[PDB]
A paper describes a structure:
Vitamin D receptor (VDR) is a ligand-dependent transcriptional factor belonging to the nuclear receptor superfamily, and mediates most of the biological functions of vitamin D3, including calcium and phosphate homeostasis, bone metabolism, and immune regulation. Lithocholic acid (LCA, 2) is a secondary bile acid formed from chenodeoxycholate, and was identified as a second endogenous agonist of VDR.
According to the method reported in our previous study, a synthetic peptide containing the target sequence of the coactivator MED1 (mediator of RNA polymerase II transcription subunit 1, also known as ARC205 or DRIP205) was included in the crystallization solution of VDR LBD and the test compound. However, the analysis was successful only for the complex of compound 7b. The electron density map clearly shows the VDR LBD, the coactivator peptide, the ligand and a relatively low number of water molecules. Figure 5a shows the overall structure of the VDR LBD complex with 7b; it is similar to those previously reported for VDR LBD complexes with other lithocholic acid derivatives. The hydroxyl group in the 3-substituent of 7b forms direct hydrogen bonds with two histidine residues, His301 (O···N distance: 2.79 Å) and His393 (O···N distance: 2.68 Å). Instead, the terminal carboxyl group of 7b formed hydrogen bonds with Arg270 (O···N distance: 2.82 Å) and the backbone amide bond of Tyr143 (O···N distance: 2.91 Å).
Residue numbers in the entry:
A (entry chain A): 123 to 145, 152 to 157, 219 to 420
B (entry chain C): 626 to 635
Write the structure that this text describes.
């Protein structure tokens, strides 16, 4: 049954998410969309950082550990948070108006291939099929970020203790608040989605390394994108 | 080596 502490965490994560997710950039136009979507991702990294800072216990981590968690989770959290604006009606990210509505055609014009885009879209469909509560969605984003198995973490035990608190809150939430049979193996399906994001992260990194090796494309990126994803 | 990330954290 959900403790005071557990309800507190959920309340904090929902508010952090509402404050940092809104359903200025170079305008949308094989690379025609790279400037706009580099800007969109660069901006979305700032939102991820805004959310991460409000995760209970995140602030207790060293600056270095905060940096390695954010560097390694940022693209995964961007893909994961986008799910709320994703519409199975026409497999698009429909951010209000048609200018800022993104289908397979649009997101494939930024020098990334269907090797990334097709799994990304299947991931969004698979996540919609789970029909998560916003409570489960914000817990999954927090567990995604505060992960003790990211390369470069110094205090794995502290990150593990924070993640376990978040994991325990999530499992408790599912048992008390998620309607069976929708609750059945829901925790395990959500962890599987975190695994699908690690694989999407790896494919993004491979493709980013090639794209960003081409200086004519690097030129279209942003300083934050270069610092987070690399040179 | 991460000044902009560091700034956004603080
Ligand atoms: C429009 C969607 C967000 C919609 C939302 O989340 N809006 C809310 C905001 C907010 O208000 O905070 C985002 C979500 C995942 C995004 C994709 C991730 C993979 C990939 C990264 C690449 C970045 C470089 C640096 C070029 O490697 C650029 C193309 C690329 C395919 C992205 C396209 C746009 C995507 C689909």
């Amino acid at each position: 049954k959900l403790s005071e502490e557990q309800q507190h965490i959920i309340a904090i994560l929902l508010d952090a998410h509402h404050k940092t997710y809104d359903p200025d950039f170079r305008p949308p136009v094989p690379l025609s969309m790279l400037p706009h979507l580099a800007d969109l991702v660069s901006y979305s990294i700032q939102k991820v950082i805004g959310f991460a800072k409000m995760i209970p216990g995140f602030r207790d981590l060293t600056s270095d550990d905060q940096i390695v968690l954010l560097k390694s989770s940022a693209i995964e959290v961007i893909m994961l948070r986008s799910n709320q604006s994703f519409t199975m009606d026409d497999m698009s990210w429909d951010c209000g108006s048609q200018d800022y509505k993104y289908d397979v055609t649009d997101v494939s014009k930024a020098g990334h291939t269907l090797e990334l885009i097709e799994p990304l879209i299947k991931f969004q469909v698979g996540l919609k099929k789970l029909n998560l509560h916003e409570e489960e969605h914000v817990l999954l984003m927090a567990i995604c970020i505060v992960s003790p198995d990211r390369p470069g973490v110094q205090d794995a035990k502290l990150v593990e203790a924070i993640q376990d608190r978040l994991s325990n809150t999530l499992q408790t939430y599912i048992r008390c608040r998620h309607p069976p049979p929708g609750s059945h193996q829901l925790y395990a399906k959500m962890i599987q989605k975190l695994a699908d994001l690690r694989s999407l992260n790896e494919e993004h990194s491979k493709q980013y390394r090639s794209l960003s090796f081409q200086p004519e494309n690097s030129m279209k990126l942003t300083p934050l994108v270069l610092e987070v994803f690399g040179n | 080596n991460h000044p902009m990330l560091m700034n956004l954290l603080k």
